[PDB]
Structure formats: C-alpha cells, structure tokens
Write a protein of this length. Sequence first.
Length: 152
Amino acid sequence: FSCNVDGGSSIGAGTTSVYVNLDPVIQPGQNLVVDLSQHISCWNDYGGWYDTDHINLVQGSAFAGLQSYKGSLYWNNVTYPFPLTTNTNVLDIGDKTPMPLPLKLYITPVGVVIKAGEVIARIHMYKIATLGSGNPRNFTWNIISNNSVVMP
Ligand SMILES: CC(=O)N[C@@H]1[C@@H](O[C@@H]2O[C@H](CO)[C@H](O)[C@H](O)[C@H]2O)[C@@H](O)[C@@H](CO)O[C@@H]1O
C-alpha cells in the first residue's frame, strides 16, 4: 500500500507534513474547512483486488498545541466529532490507481487563530491488507497551514 502528498514520492508508513492554504480571515462561529482530498492520495501496490488494503482513521487523532477547538472530521461520507474518540469506518483500496483520501476537517475556533507553520492537527491512519499477516502500517498526517488565519 502506498500514499503520496501533492504528487511527491511514495510513502509506506510514518509521519508526513501536509501543507494547506487557508482563508486568511475568519469570523466568530464561522467554520474553517480543510479539504485533504486535494493533497493526499493512496493506492494498492498490486491492483486487481488481489491483496486488498483496508484503511481507517484512528482514535486519538486530535488538534495539536488548538486543543480547545471544536471540530468535525468528514471521512468516507461520515461526519465524526473531532478529536476522534473512536476509529472511523474502513475504506477498501484494491486498485493501482491513486485514490484521493475522502477526508475533510471542519474547525470552529474558541486575533491569530492559526499560525503559519504550526501543526494544527495530527491525523492517525491505519492500514492492514488481506493476505498473510496483512502487513499493518501506521501513517500520521501532520496538517500545517502555509499562512496565518486571523479573526477580527
Ligand atoms: C510482499 C511485499 O512486501 N510487497 C511489497 C508491496 O507491499 C504490499 O502491497 C499490498 C497491496 O498494496 C498489500 O498492502 C501488502 O500488505 C503489502 O505487503 C509494495 O510495498 C511494493 C511497492 O512497490 O513492493 C512490494 O511488492
């Protein structure tokens, strides 16, 4: 199983930083959206559903540093409160075609709300396949804004 970020080189496990551009001004009660489906893609390394990969997001994925913030996480058509207090539903990947991860993060903050370059969220993703032991792998996506976000 492989992933990549903005068409970079392939990733088998571990922590990767994911840089997003955000709206530089937000208002109280307004909701900030981070669409990760534009950035991260994954695929089956053999194709044909021969050794199918099963991926989900993991309990304990949270805001970093922004722990008082409210949020939601959209994953594979379902909305979960964020931070994740349970694992998400499983996405099956069997083709050698990069599939955008169907993942969005909704943030309600509660001056500068997000600093450029600071980790905003740490999202734990788990993979296991079908044959042998399934060769389980853990990925952490460190979500980071290219610009500060301010609220009047
Ligand atoms: C047996 C092995 O290590 N194979 C490598 C591939 O990994 C596997 O891929 C399948 C389908 O994605 C499944 O996830 C297995 O659990 C996993 O072992 C893959 O890493 C490729 C990359 O070119 O190299 C070997 O084929």
